[PDB]
Amino acid sequence: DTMKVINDPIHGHIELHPLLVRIIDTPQFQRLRYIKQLGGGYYVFPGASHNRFEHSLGVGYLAGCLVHALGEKQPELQISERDVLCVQIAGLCHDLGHGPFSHMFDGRFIPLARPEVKWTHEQGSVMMFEHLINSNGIKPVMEQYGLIPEEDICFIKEQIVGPLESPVEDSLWPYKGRPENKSFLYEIVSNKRNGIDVDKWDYFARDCHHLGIQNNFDYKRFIKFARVCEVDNELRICARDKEVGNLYDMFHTRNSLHRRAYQHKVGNIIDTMITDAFLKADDYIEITGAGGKKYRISTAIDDMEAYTKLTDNIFLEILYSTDPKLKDAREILKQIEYRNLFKYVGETQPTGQIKIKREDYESLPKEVASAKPKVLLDVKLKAEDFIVDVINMDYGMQEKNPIDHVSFYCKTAPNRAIRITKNQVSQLLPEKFAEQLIRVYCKKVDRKSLYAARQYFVQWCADRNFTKPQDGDVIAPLITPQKKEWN
Amino acid sequence: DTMKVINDPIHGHIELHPLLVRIIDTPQFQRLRYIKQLGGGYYVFPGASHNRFEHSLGVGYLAGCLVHALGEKQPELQISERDVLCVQIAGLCHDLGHGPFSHMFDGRFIPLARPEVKWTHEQGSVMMFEHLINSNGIKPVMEQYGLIPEEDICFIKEQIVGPLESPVEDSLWPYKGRPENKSFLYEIVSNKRNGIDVDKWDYFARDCHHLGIQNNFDYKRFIKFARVCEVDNELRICARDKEVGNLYDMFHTRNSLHRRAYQHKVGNIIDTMITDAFLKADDYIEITGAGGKKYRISTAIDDMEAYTKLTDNIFLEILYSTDPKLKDAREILKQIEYRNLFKYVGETQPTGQIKIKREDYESLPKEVASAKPKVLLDVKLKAEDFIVDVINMDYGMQEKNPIDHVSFYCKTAPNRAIRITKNQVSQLLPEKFAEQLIRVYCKKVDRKSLYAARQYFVQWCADRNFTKPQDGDVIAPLITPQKKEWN
Amino acid sequence: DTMKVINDPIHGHIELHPLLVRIIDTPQFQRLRYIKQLGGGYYVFPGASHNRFEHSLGVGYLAGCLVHALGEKQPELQISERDVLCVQIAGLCHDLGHGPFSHMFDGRFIPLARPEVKWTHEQGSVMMFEHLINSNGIKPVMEQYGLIPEEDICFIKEQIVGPLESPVEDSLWPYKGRPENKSFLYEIVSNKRNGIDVDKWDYFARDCHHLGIQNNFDYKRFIKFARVCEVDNELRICARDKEVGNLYDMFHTRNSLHRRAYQHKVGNIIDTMITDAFLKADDYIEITGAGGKKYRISTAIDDMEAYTKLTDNIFLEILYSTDPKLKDAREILKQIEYRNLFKYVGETQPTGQIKIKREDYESLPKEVASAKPKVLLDVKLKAEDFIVDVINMDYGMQEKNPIDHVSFYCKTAPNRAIRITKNQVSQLLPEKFAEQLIRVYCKKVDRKSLYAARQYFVQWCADRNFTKPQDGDVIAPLITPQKKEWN
Amino acid sequence: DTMKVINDPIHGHIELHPLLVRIIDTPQFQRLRYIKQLGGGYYVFPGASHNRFEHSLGVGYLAGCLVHALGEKQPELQISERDVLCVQIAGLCHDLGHGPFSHMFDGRFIPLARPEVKWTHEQGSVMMFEHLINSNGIKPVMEQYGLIPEEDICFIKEQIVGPLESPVEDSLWPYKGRPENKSFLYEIVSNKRNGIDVDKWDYFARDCHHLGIQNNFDYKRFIKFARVCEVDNELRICARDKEVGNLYDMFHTRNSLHRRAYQHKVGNIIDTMITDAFLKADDYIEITGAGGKKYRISTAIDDMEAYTKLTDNIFLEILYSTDPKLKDAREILKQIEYRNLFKYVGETQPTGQIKIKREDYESLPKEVASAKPKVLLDVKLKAEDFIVDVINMDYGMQEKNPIDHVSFYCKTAPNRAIRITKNQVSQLLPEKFAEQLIRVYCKKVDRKSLYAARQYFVQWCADRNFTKPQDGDVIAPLITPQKKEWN
Ligand SMILES: Nc1nc(=O)c2ncn([C@H]3C[C@H](O)[C@@H](CO[P@@](=O)(S)OP(=O)(O)OP(=O)(O)O)O3)c2[nH]1
Ligand SMILES: Nc1nc(=O)c2ncn([C@H]3C[C@H](O)[C@@H](CO[P@@](=O)(S)OP(=O)(O)OP(=O)(O)O)O3)c2[nH]1
Ligand SMILES: Nc1nc(=O)c2ncn([C@H]3C[C@H](O)[C@@H](CO[P@@](=O)(S)OP(=O)(O)OP(=O)(O)O)O3)c2[nH]1
């Protein structure tokens, strides 16, 4: 088992340990080779045709590079090859469990297919990791390369998802993967304290390189300016005190990428319509589970033998199906094929301090259809013809500043960690880190319906004291004069 | 129908005419959205996950740009918007007909599935264009935008494939798409005289950008240094006389891309094994054709209603199939999934002026198994365990210099065209433009079989007076001393 | 006079009109070939070795591209080749007048060498343009290519500097370069209404490409999404309504470039010390003016015959001089050569609404030396050993939002212009657009002096109720506990 | 003395050892900050404004990276930090001695200013290194960081120039810098056996990045595929056997860069004219040497105190000089300023196996003026009005294949080195590695003189049986019919 090298386009050549090569060369990992990282973005950005396989390889490589650099800079941390291999394995296998198209399954399909279950892709990745290890017989190979599987597997699971048995909430680090003195290893692959991790850097670089946008972050500079320092009696990764501006720039880059590509109108509506097609085709798609069992699309997240075959393939299954049962879903997919998409109406910005929770997402069309515009409307619409899409823009921490939970070190004292407040960096920084934006769409493709939907949406926005739409004075100029505050 | 813009990663923003938008928004074009441009290269280069949809859009955009620039530079050519739209449509719809994985279907699957038929992807693209036009009702829209479909469609077909009714061979341009004075329009999308066309530039740029290699060509400089000049009583596109070095560099870049990425050992063997899986699964895959007819994978190239659904999907059809009939093909695909690939043995270079034709491709394993090495071999192999792979490296014209069929103009006389010979450019240019290289693989994964196959291959190479393999003195050092000429 | 092409690294190939070729091939333009765009940044960023010649060529090319695109999109604007040539000439000759190192001369050297005169580089560019035209005999060539010099020269001067004879302040556009209907041509090269112009885009791209930072702006998308629309009875260039986020991103990119490269600590101190060397060497450097007159460095801005030879050369004049008169300046330059720079002390942020004006810049060291820290200091410092450096960070408009003066158009009404407020875009935008930051340096290189200067600076910051320094708890931990508000 | 980091645009962030920081922060190294790497290329490619300072830093960084990687891969080589520091210092100080504009001084100015002396820039770099060490007192610092100056300085000199005392020619490595077992350290900075070294990679990347051309080489892949293997009883750096194609591509990239940018027509003529200006201004420029001595431009290569101040500054010295003695040189420089360059005539290719040596370079204009064309010429020219420019294109080894002196290793035997012949790689490789091309220019700018010079040049080419010029049938169509072999 000789070391293997791959020519990645973002990170050049990547060297992979033989244990990593054995882990990737399994069906549970090659399943990621057929899942798009940007599901609905491929139908808006033609170049965004990259899967999660490359992203997983890159995240593993970056985690290995960061841990190797941290070990080289501070030999006193006692970082062994076992820790390097474990953090690399956590990096590669952090996205093992993803549904088709990789985001609507986790955030739109499952919440509608089965709202009772609470499912997230990290849990699916953990279960797929267990299935991979058990099915492929990886533990002998792990023991061959100096790894202790009984605790290394727990360490990898804790890296991927966090505290396994229960939330900590007591006992002062009752963890079972690594001791207290290795507390800096729970932040390399998925940092749950401030969000700065190699996963963010990798998808930043890859998405910018593929979409056609330019990236405004340099992870190598952060790597060269990061040191492990004792913070409140545990070792946390700390950055140089002059890098706070670059960290704010990283979060601004995340916000801009979400604004421009991940929350596109057409991409969001296409994801919604593919989700509707999946919901309509759920009852007639059967996936062979374990021991000959048959599983639906929505129920395949309970058996990883079936979930291994639940990839982007079901889209072309429905599209090419001749079964009359799947007719409605096939028609929806063909409407997508003809770009007969649902029509955009408008956006808004809630202004009150209270934001609408996910429990009220489906009640919005009812209120939208209840509007009573004082304009000559020749057609009356129904909530069935209205679609709302609530989007939350944040910095990884909803209401809290992610930089407020970062520790910095200076040149004079390379081992003392300090906190830098927002006002000590610049006065040209965002005053808020959470905002909400609501889209509204129409399912009809006739101009009269478009006019009626626009009037209803503008009247609804004016009713609940929402923001003035960016083009409220053109599409519906008969309602804005009523809103005195808007002018 | 307002003009639409797409954010391509290679060409930035691209503006599309409403007729183009109508042409692309059809199932026959979105079928390209699910066909990888590099079939087996995705399993060697992780980043090469780009389809033919983006490539078609880019080729159309580049054809439009080139024709617009040529029209602007020389207003006397009388280039109308009709010609621009026609060349753009030829650019977008030049790769409509591609099989799954886009290259093994055209060059490996069909020649083995049905050797009697002579099929090429240009013919399939022509038939898919006909089907698109007829099914989607494009002719009224073409007439709406000033196009004459009866001759414009013939012009587009001639652009894609060439002379439709028969080879010219007489009558001095009996063509029916465009008059003699527009002879320079048959070279923008697919140049069949010297090979310089926007298709080459687009896949150069895209493949370099995605694989991870750097490109050594600048198409914008060629565009700025190209003029239409009368050549032997027809108008041909001519380049500046100082660009001959850059053209040779373009062909060298093509050769290097073929050498490094398109002819990779692992990619070629993976394509061969997927082709074998398709051949084994042919008899049990049915695609619903026109009017309820059922078509196989190999017979779906006779009905474009069925061929519209023959994409990369059949790979995951076979892989995820529970049908016991498809068991052998499923096992082959799972062997691919486990990276239990066939093992590399060696390469060679024919030295005689006579190269082995495609008619003798399948007879090579018989001669390979017939070798009698004078070494202690404990296992005897069979031709069934041997795979050969003949690769032809050329410049687009097999034995002829492509630059020998290019006309150049100078600054003093911007309308007189001249020919530049090879010796007038440099003495550091290739003396030959055609070479052949033969790979040999083994289907067994035991070291004894590897040793036996290596000995057989080395003895076969020494028997027929072939070149000494690049590592013939290490893998098999007991045979090279016999070859006196090799040392 | 045939059209010429140059291979720029940022904009690829650039085609230049013969009038432009004649204008550039003069000493007054090649003088820019020896003036660094980033004066003190070359001694911090090794790659920033680009002059103003390339920047001028790029700005001219971008102005030509923008005007050509605007003319093509709207033929009703009646844009002739005369306007294209005039805006191009304004683009190339917008930075003709720059001092050595191009920024300290305009903003640091002249205000200290002769505070009485009010001089800016635009005035010098105007006078150099006049001198170029008169000396090289350009007017016959301008008349040869259809330009009317008597008004075209006035138009170019108005583009470079604005209203020539007097501020408008009345008469409703009494301009003498172009009529009212061409009001959109005063914004292509140097936009004085909102700051969006090709100069910003060009130095963005070039500085990012040379420093080593990545750019977060796409000017081509803005070009494709810009239209001329009547605004308050004059034609102004308007952007698409969906581009407000990208415009805010452009201003954020400007802020980040200023923060990271243009306001660097070492670069600023090196510029200050080179300015001091120039001030000390002023009295002994003579430049031959017009008619044999002799001019100093500071007085050469009154005669463009002398100013044509006042480039970055005087740095090496002083450095290599054997004249004992220039000894002090030579010693300062050699101290720069040995990197025996003045030592950094700290930075601060004024918190009061009132900012300190440039009239009080030199009075700050007096107040700094007057501090009385309650720490054991064994050495007392003087204001002569203290250097302050006030930096203003803005968006091009000091206290005003630059986007508040931009007009937008929508797809439904491509000719009606609207205003978009900040709250209608996002709640994650800066609440302020002006901030001030003050650096402090020490001229001595002994650690005791460093400690004393740090204590004095921290006490001064605590005295005037300034912000807490980002490392006030380490370099001087004995003063921060006194500031209760800081903790 | 803490480690310092610089943000290079090509290599990102570079970490520098404190000894390196002390070595660079001297006048003898900052002298490179004002010497253009491409002298005459800056007046053809506007973006090529990069000096030798960045190139030296990059070469040092790449040498350090290569040696560190080689040490990490093979711990048995016993590579200490002393060797790393020594190879880094050799990398930074490999181009210390360069004349103004960095190439015409070494290859055109000195051979004409003083043909008796044999001077090369490596000797000047060695003497500048000696002067730097002695003047700045570096030896105590070298001893502080574990370096043995008496032998380390000899090792660095041997790296820069080779055998110091005498050519080896006997004694089987009588070297005095490093023992026989460290023979692989004489190839990292300047490889004199096959030419593959970090200097080539660095200027490849930097020149491509600045000119505007795209690079076709990846040095990181070569670094990852390079191992030290015993070859003929000494340790040489060997590459992977599959990298022979990439090495040939590297040499092809060098050839293309020379063809397109380093041997440009206008750049070469501008370098020639600046050399002529220097030759005319030699007698009136005095540089203060050591102990008050005065040195000319040509005689400043005998005293490094004077040579430290001989940079690109003398160009602006001559250009801005008011001394009537320098009038002719000032006029030549102003002719350059006005782009009144000498006019191009044509190029040729010698066909005989014997090439014309440098001893006959100045005799060519005499033979050119002696031509007797059989055309109606109204003006007779003189050899004084003719300029020839002989250019040699090679692969770093004049008549020999550089890859013929490279050793390769395979995966099966990572310690046995083998030789790969050209015919074992491809049949599409150059058959010759040396070619010669001769340019001819005219000093007059009247069309009649241009016609006369073109006729004379074409007749001269036809006389000596040279190649047919690429445009011999247009500029002079009355002579080519005489040359029967040319048609
Ligand atoms: N570089 C870039 N930045 C962005 O901010 C951005 N947003 C989209 N795109 C890409 C996505 C596509 O590839 C392309 C078109 O996006 P457009 O949003 S202008 O298109 P429609 O949805 O039709 O908007 P309209 O309401 O005017 O009809 O640009 C972008 N590309
Ligand atoms: N990318 C690129 N490749 C090349 O091969 C090349 N050669 C030059 N340039 C750059 C150098 C300049 O920046 C620009 C113009 O070079 P041009 O050689 S077309 O110009 P003239 O010398 O005037 O040739 P003419 O005989 O027709 O007048 O292109 C090049 N740029
Ligand atoms: N990419 C990049 N981003 C930045 O924000 C930045 N700032 C500087 N540089 C470049 C400029 C140089 O090329 C390099 C070093 O800059 P550094 O500011 S870390 O160095 P010192 O001034 O010595 O800071 P210290 O106070 O720790 O001693 O990085 C930067 N490079």
Full 3-state SS string of chain B: CCCEEEEECCCEEEEECHHHHHHHCCHHHHHHHHCECCCHHHHCCCCCCCEHHHHHHHHHHHHHHHHHHHHHHCHHHCCCHHHHHHHHHHHHCCCCCCCCCCCHHHHHHHHHHCCCCCCCHHHHHHHHHHHHHHHHCCHHHHHHCCCCHHHHHHHHHHHHHCCCCCCCCCCCCCCCCCCHHHHHHHHCCCCCCCCCCHHHHHHHHHHHHHHCCCCCCCHHHHHHCEEEEEECCEEEEEEEHHHHHHHHHHHHHHHHHHHHHHCCHHHHHHHHHHHHHHHHHHHHCCEECHHHCEECCCCHHHCHHHHCCCCCHHHHHHHCCCCHHHHHHHHHHHHHHCCCCCEEEEEECCCCCCCCCHHHCCCHHHHHHCCCCCCCCCCCCCHHHEEEEEEEECCCCCCCCHHHHCCEECCCCCCCCECCCHHHCCCCCECCCCEEEEEEEECCCCHHHHHHHHHHHHHHHHHCCCCCCCCCCCCCCCCHHHCCCCC
Taking the C-alpha atoms of residue D239 and residue A56, their distance in angstroms, rounded to an integer, is 30
Chain-centroid distance of CA D173 in Å reads: 28
Q: Is D245 on the interface with C (CB under 8 A)?
A: no
Taking the C-alpha atoms of residue B45 and residue B63, their distance in angstroms, rounded to an integer, is 29
Q: In whole angstroms, how far apart are CA D42 and each of A71, B71, C294, D332?
A: 45, 34, 31, 18
Which ligand places an atom closest to the C-alpha of A266?
A: 1
Q: Is the CB of residue A53 less than 8 Å from the CB of residue A30?
A: yes
Taking the C-alpha atoms of residue B301 and residue B110, their distance in angstroms, rounded to an integer, is 9
**Nearest C-alpha in D relative to A221:** D13
Q: In whole angstroms, how far apart are CA B308 and each of B26, B125, B305?
A: 11, 11, 5
Third-level CATH fold of B4-263: Hypothetical protein af1432 (1.10.3210)
Exposed e or buried b for every residue in C119-142, given b needs 16+ CB within 10 A?
Answer: bebbebbbbbbebbbeebebeebb
- Positive or negative, the CA dihedral C70, C76, C77, C78 is positive
Distance C466 CA to ligand 3 centre (A): 26
Tokens of A385: 């013809």
Taking only Cα atoms into account, the Rg of chain A, rounded to an integer number of angstroms, comes to 25
Taking the C-alpha atoms of residue A350 and residue A356, their distance in angstroms, rounded to an integer, is 9
Taking the C-alpha atoms of residue C371 and residue C391, their distance in angstroms, rounded to an integer, is 22
Q: Is D450 on the interface with B (CB under 8 A)?
A: no
Taking the C-alpha atoms of residue B385 and residue B398, their distance in angstroms, rounded to an integer, is 32
Torsion over CA of A333, A337, A343 and A344, rounded to 10 degrees?
A: 100
Torsion over CA of C462, C466, C471 and C472, rounded to 10 degrees?
A: 10
Nearest 5°: phi and psi at C103?
Answer: -130, -40
Instruction: Give the E-state strand segments of D174-321 in sequence order.
Output: 226-231, 234-240, 287-288, 294-295
Torsion over CA of D53, D57, D62 and D63, rounded to 10 degrees?
A: 100
Alpha-helical runs (H) found in C74-148 = 81-92, 104, 110-113, 121-136, 139-144
Taking the C-alpha atoms of residue C12 and residue C220, their distance in angstroms, rounded to an integer, is 14
Closest CA to D232 of D420, D403, D417: D417
Atom of ligand 1 nearest to the CA of A212: 1
Interface of D with A in 382-411 (CB under 8 A): 411
Taking the C-alpha atoms of residue C59 and residue C198, their distance in angstroms, rounded to an integer, is 6
Strands C408-409 and C294-295: unpaired
Nearest 5°: phi and psi at A239?
Answer: -105, 160
Closest CA to C130 of C299, C288, C305: C305
Taking the C-alpha atoms of residue C423 and residue A467, their distance in angstroms, rounded to an integer, is 8
**Ligand 1 pocket residue status of A258, Cβ below 6 Å:** no
Taking the C-alpha atoms of residue B337 and residue B329, their distance in angstroms, rounded to an integer, is 12
Tokens of A353: 């301090």
**Nearest C-alpha in C relative to B411:** C2
Q: Which DSSP state fits D349? A: -
Q: In whole angstroms, how far apart are CA B391 and each of B199, B339, D430?
A: 22, 23, 21
- B426, D410: Cβ pair inside 8 Å? no
Q: Is C473 on the interface with A (CB under 8 A)?
A: yes
Name the residue among A245, A260, A349 with its Cβ closest to that of C259.
A245
Q: Is the CB of residue B274 less than 8 Å from the CB of residue B336?
A: yes
Q: Is the CB of residue A97 less than 8 Å from the CB of residue A34?
A: no
Q: Is D47 on the interface with C (CB under 8 A)?
A: yes
Atom of ligand 3 nearest to the CA of A245: 5
**Ligand 3 pocket residue status of C129, Cβ below 6 Å:** no
Which conformational region is residue B175 in: left (phi greater than 0), alpha (psi within -120 to 50 degrees), or beta?
beta
Taking the C-alpha atoms of residue B280 and residue C401, their distance in angstroms, rounded to an integer, is 68
Q: Is the CB of residue B389 less than 8 Å from the CB of residue B268?
A: yes
Distance A264 CA to ligand 1 centre (A): 8
Torsion over CA of A365, A369, A372 and A375, rounded to 10 degrees?
A: 110
Closest CA to B311 of B25, B93, B20, B32: B32
Taking the C-alpha atoms of residue C97 and residue C131, their distance in angstroms, rounded to an integer, is 11
Mutate to test the pocket of ligand 3, among A218, A220, A221, A224 (most ligand atoms within 8 A of CB): A221
Nearest 5°: phi and psi at D315?
Answer: -60, -50
Tokens of B73: 């530079």
Nearest 5°: phi and psi at B235?
Answer: -85, 115
Q: Which DSSP state fits A105? A: I
Evaluate whether the domain defined by A343-392+434-482 bears CATH number 3.40.50.300: no
Nearest 5°: phi and psi at C298?
Answer: -75, -25
Q: Which residues contact A160 (CB under 8 A, 6 or more apart)?
A: A90, A93, A94, A122, A125, A126, A129, A189, A190
Tokens of B390: 């003949």
Distance from CA of D140 to the nearest CA of B (A): 46
Taking the C-alpha atoms of residue D201 and residue D190, their distance in angstroms, rounded to an integer, is 11
H helix count then E strand count, chain A? 18, 10
Taking the C-alpha atoms of residue A246 and residue A251, their distance in angstroms, rounded to an integer, is 9
**CB atoms inside a 10 Å sphere around CB C358:** 10
**Ligand 2 pocket residue status of B224, Cβ below 6 Å:** no
Q: Which DSSP state fits A455? A: H
**To 5 degrees, how large is the angle CA B199–CA B205–CA B209?**
145
Tokens of B130: 């006909």
**Ligand 2 pocket residue status of B218, Cβ below 6 Å:** yes
How many CA atoms lie within 13 Å of B387's alpha carbon, on the beta-carbon side? Answer: 19
**Best B345, B351, B393, B428 residue to mutate vs chain D (most D CBs within 10 Å):** B428
Mutate to test the pocket of ligand 3, among C260, C341, C347, C474 (most ligand atoms within 8 A of CB): C260
SS3 D123: helix
User: What kind of architecture, by CATH, is found in domain D344-392+434-482?
Assistant: 2-Layer Sandwich (3.30)
Q: Is B420 on the interface with D (CB under 8 A)?
A: yes
**To 5 degrees, how large is the angle CA D192–CA D197–CA D203?**
120
Closest CA to B207 of B289, B152, B262: B262
Q: Which DSSP state fits D300? A: G
Name the residue among D214, D432, D467 with its Cβ closest to that of B214.
D214
Domain ranges of chain C: 4-263, 268-337, 343-392+434-482
- B211, A26: Cβ pair inside 8 Å? no
Q: Which residues contact C84 (CB under 8 A, 6 or more apart)?
A: C64, C67, C68, C71
Taking the C-alpha atoms of residue D371 and residue D367, their distance in angstroms, rounded to an integer, is 7
Q: Which residues contact A10 (CB under 8 A, 6 or more apart)?
A: A54, A58, A202, A205, A206, A209, B47
Q: Which residues pair with C437 in a beta bridge?
A: C391
Q: Fill in the amino acid letter for A374.
A: K
Place of tokens 């590592």: B471
Q: Is the CB of residue D305 less than 8 Å from the CB of residue D290?
A: yes
Resolution limit, Å:
2.9
Q: For helices D149-161 and D121-136, give the axis angle rounded to 10 degrees.
A: 160
Q: How far apart are the first and last CA of chain D?
A: 71
Q: Is the CB of residue A158 less than 8 Å from the CB of residue A183?
A: no
Exposed e or buried b for every residue in D117-145, given b needs 16+ CB within 10 A?
Answer: eebebbebbbbbbebbbeebebeebbeee
Distance from CA of D234 to the nearest CA of B (A): 21
**Ligand 3 pocket residue status of D2, Cβ below 6 Å:** no
Tokens of B377: 């071999």
How many CA atoms lie within 13 Å of A1's alpha carbon, on the beta-carbon side? Answer: 12
Q: Based on the residue annotation, tell me whether C17 is a catalytic residue of this protein.
A: no
Q: Is B378 on the interface with A (CB under 8 A)?
A: no
Q: In whole angstroms, how far apart are CA D306 and each of A381, D31, D35, D286, D310?
A: 89, 12, 15, 9, 7
Closest CA to B325 of B280, B295, B356: B280
Tokens of B263: 């002819």
Taking the C-alpha atoms of residue D375 and residue A430, their distance in angstroms, rounded to an integer, is 79
Distance C10 CA to ligand 1 centre (A): 24
Taking the C-alpha atoms of residue A300 and residue A99, their distance in angstroms, rounded to an integer, is 10
Task: Give contacts of A54 with chain B, Cβ < 8 Å.
Answer: 46-47, 49
Which ligand places an atom closest to the C-alpha of D42?
A: 2
Q: Is the CB of residue A294 less than 8 Å from the CB of residue A288?
A: yes
Q: Which residues pair with A347 in a beta bridge?
A: A439
| Binding-site residue set of A for GTP | 4-5, 25, 30, 33, 339, 343, 411
- C15, B224: Cβ pair inside 8 Å? yes
Strands D294-295 and D386-393: unpaired
- A46, B53: Cβ pair inside 8 Å? yes
SS3 A43: helix
Taking the C-alpha atoms of residue C224 and residue C236, their distance in angstroms, rounded to an integer, is 16
Closest C-alpha residue for ligand 2 atom 29: C7
Q: Which residues contact C473 (CB under 8 A, 6 or more apart)?
A: A418, C480
Taking the C-alpha atoms of residue C137 and residue C155, their distance in angstroms, rounded to an integer, is 19
Name the residue among D27, D42, D54 with its Cβ closest to that of C47.
D54
Nearest 5°: phi and psi at B151?
Answer: -100, -30
Third-level CATH fold of D4-263+399-424: Hypothetical protein af1432 (1.10.3210)
Q: Which residues pair with C237 in a beta bridge?
A: C228
Q: Is C485 on the interface with A (CB under 8 A)?
A: no
Distance C41 CA to ligand 3 centre (A): 11
How many CA atoms lie within 13 Å of D159's alpha carbon, on the beta-carbon side? Answer: 34
Taking the C-alpha atoms of residue B39 and residue B107, their distance in angstroms, rounded to an integer, is 12
Q: Is C348 on the interface with A (CB under 8 A)?
A: no
Which ligand places an atom closest to the C-alpha of A257?
A: 1
Q: Is the CB of residue B98 less than 8 Å from the CB of residue B105?
A: yes
Third-level CATH fold of B344-392+436-482: Alpha-Beta Plaits (3.30.70)
Torsion over CA of D101, D104, D110 and D115, rounded to 10 degrees?
A: 180
Q: Fill in the amino acid letter for A45.
A: F
Distance C265 CA to ligand 3 centre (A): 9
Q: Which residues pair with D439 in a beta bridge?
A: D347, D389
Q: Which DSSP state fits D162? A: S
Tokens of D31: 């002298």
Closest CA to D391 of D194, D258, D249: D258
Mutate to test the pocket of ligand 2, among B242, B243, B410 (most ligand atoms within 8 A of CB): B242
Q: In whole angstroms, how far apart are CA C217 and each of A212, A253, C58?
A: 12, 12, 16
Q: Is B148 on the interface with D (CB under 8 A)?
A: no
**Nearest C-alpha in B relative to D395:** B428
Closest CA to B9 of A477, D377, A46, C428: A46
SS3 D460: helix
Asked whether residue D380 is marked as a ligand-binding residue, the answer is: no
Strands A226-231 and A234-240: antiparallel
Q: Annotated active-site positions of D, please?
A: 121
**To 5 degrees, how large is the angle CA C358–CA C360–CA C361?**
65
Taking only Cα atoms into account, the Rg of chain D, rounded to an integer number of angstroms, comes to 25
Q: Is the CB of residue C112 less than 8 Å from the CB of residue C275?
A: yes
Mutate to test the pocket of ligand 3, among C255, C258, C264 (most ligand atoms within 8 A of CB): C264
Q: Is the CB of residue C131 less than 8 Å from the CB of residue C123?
A: no
Nearest 5°: phi and psi at C322?
Answer: -100, 5
